[PDB]
Structure formats: C-alpha cells, structure tokens
C-alpha cells in the first residue's frame, strides 16, 4: 500500500551516482536518496529525487538488507552486463511494502 513510482535509469554515464542513507536495522529501514552526483546516470535520468526511498531494485525487495548489502545490490545492478538500465521502485513517503 505505499504510493510508488517505477523509475528506469538508463546507463547513460559511467557512474550511477546516488548517495543513500539507511537500510535494515536502522530508523530509515530502506535506503533513502540524500544527494545525486551531477553528471552521472541518476542525474541524467531526472526522475530520481532526493528523498526517494528505494523499495525494490529490478524487482528485488531491499527489505531486510543492511546498508552495505543494499549498496552492493545497487552497484551490481549498475555494473551488470544483463541489461543497460536499472528499474528502481521508489516512494516519496515512509510507508513500506
């Protein structure tokens, strides 16, 4: 029941470039975007915002993933040769799936 948006980030630059806070076992239990690297893929996408909470990466829930593991999954999603994009399911609010 959260209000969510599926944002596709194409790999238009050599970096993804998002700073994320939080993760499991913290008071921000899913990663929240706190800033965006100018000139990176997330910036070029335009649809990712500071304050966006990442519910899923390519359909995979981040619930229960501690910060370092969530960061690892997102890094792998950006590096993969499977596809030239990442789909982030995001929400502006504090309701989780």
């Amino acid at each position: 029941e959260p209000t969510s948006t599926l944002v596709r980030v194409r790999k238009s630059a050599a970096t993804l470039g998002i700073a994320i806070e939080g993760g499991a076992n913290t008071r921000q239990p899913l990663p929240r975007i706190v800033t965006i690297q100018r000139g990176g893929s997330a910036h070029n996408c335009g649809q990712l915002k500071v304050g966006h909470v990442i519910l899923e990466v390519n359909g995979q829930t981040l619930r229960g993933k501690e910060h370092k593991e969530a960061a690892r999954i997102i890094a792998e999603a950006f590096k993969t040769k499977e596809r030239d994009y990442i789909d982030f399911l995001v929400t502006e609010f504090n309701v989780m799936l």
Binding site: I18, A19, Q28, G40, H67, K68, A75
Partner: peptide, 7 residues
C-alpha cells in the same frame, strides 16, 4: 544512520 555513495 549510515550513508554512502554508489558510483
């Protein structure tokens, strides 16, 4: 709350 960059 931890914070880090994913480049």
């Amino acid at each position: 709350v931890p914070v880090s960059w994913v480049y």
